[PDB]
Amino acid sequence: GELAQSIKELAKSIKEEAWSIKELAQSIKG
Amino acid sequence: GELAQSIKELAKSIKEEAWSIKELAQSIKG
Amino acid sequence: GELAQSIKELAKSIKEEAWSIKELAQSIKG
Amino acid sequence: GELAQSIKELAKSIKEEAWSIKELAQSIKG
Amino acid sequence: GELAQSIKELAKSIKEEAWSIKELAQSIKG
Amino acid sequence: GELAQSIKELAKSIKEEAWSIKELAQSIKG
Amino acid sequence: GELAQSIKELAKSIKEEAWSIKELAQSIKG
C-alpha cells in the first residue's frame, strides 16, 4: 500500500538525482 | 500514514522526502 | 504503543531530512 | 521490543544525516 | 511483499547515485 | 530478530553517510 | 525474511554512497 508506494517514489527521485550528478560530471569533463 | 496513522505520517515524510529530491535533482541541472 | 511511537520518530526525522535537502537545493540554486 | 528500538536508532541516524546535509548547505551558501 | 520490493528499488537507486558521485569526484580530480 | 538487526545495520550505514557529508561540508568550507 | 534482506541491501548501498561522498570530499580538498 501507501508506504511501499512512497518508497518507490523516493527511489525514483534518487535515480533522477543520480542522473543529474552524472550530467554535472560530464559537464566538468572535457 | 505519517511515515509514507504512523506509517501514514511516515508515507507523508517519505513522499515529502521524495519532493525534496526533485528540487535538488533539479537544482543541479541548472 | 512503543512501536507506533518509534515510527512517528522516524517520520519526523525524514521530514527534517526533507527540509535539509530543500535547503541544500536552495543553496545550489543561489 | 527490539524492533521499536531498532527503528529509534534509524530515526537517530536520519536526524544526523539531516544535520549534515544542513551543514553542507551552509558550507555551499558561505 | 511490495514493501521489500520498494526497498530493493531504493537500494538500486542509491547505488546509481553512489556511482554518479564517484564520477563527479573523478571529473573534479584533475 | 533478523528484521531489527537489519534496521540496525541500515542505521549504521546512514551514520557513515552522515559522516561523509560532514567531511564534504568541511572540504567545501576549506 | 525478504524484508530484512531488502533492508540489508539498502544498508550496503548507503555504505557505497558514503564511500563515494568521501571520495568527492577528497577530490574537492585536493
Author numbering:
A (entry chain G), B (entry chain A), C (entry chain B), D (entry chain C), E (entry chain F), F (entry chain D), ...: 1 to 30
What's the paper's own text on this?
CCs are quaternary structures comprising two or more α-helices supercoiled around each other with cyclic (Cn) or dihedral (Dn) symmetry. Here, we describe variants with all combinations of the aliphatic residues, Ile, Leu and Val, at a and d to give four classes of peptide: the ββ class, with a and d = Ile or Val; Lβ, a = Leu and d = Ile or Val; βL, a = Ile or Val and d = Leu; and LL, a = d = Leu. Peptides are named systematically appending the one-letter code for the amino acids at the a and d sites to “CC-Type2-“; e.g., CC-Hept becomes CC-Type2-LI. In summary, solution-phase data and X-ray crystal structures demonstrate conclusively that different classes of Type-2 coiled-coil (CC) peptides—i.e., based on abcdefg repeats with predominantly hydrophobic residues at a, d, e and g—adopt a range of distinct states.
Specifically, we mutated the centremost Leu at d (position 17) to Glu to give CC-Type2-IL-Sg-L17E and CC-Type2-LL-L17E. Both transitions were pH dependent with stabilities increasing sharply below pH 6–7. Neither of the L17E peptides bound DPH, but both sequestered its cationic derivative trimethyl-ammonium DPH (TMA-DPH) with μM affinities suggesting that the barrel states are accessible. Thus, L17E expands the collapsed hexamer of CC-Type2-IL to include a seventh helix and to reveal an accessible central channel. The experiments and calculations for CC-Type2-IL-Sg-L17E were similar; although, as expected for an open barrel, for a given charge state the macroscopic pKa values were lower than for the collapsed structure of CC-Type2-LL-L17E. For CC-Type2-IL-Sg-L17E, the central cavity was hydrated throughout the simulation. Moreover, this state appears to be more accessible to IL, fitting our contention that β-branched residues at a and d promote the α-helical-barrel state.
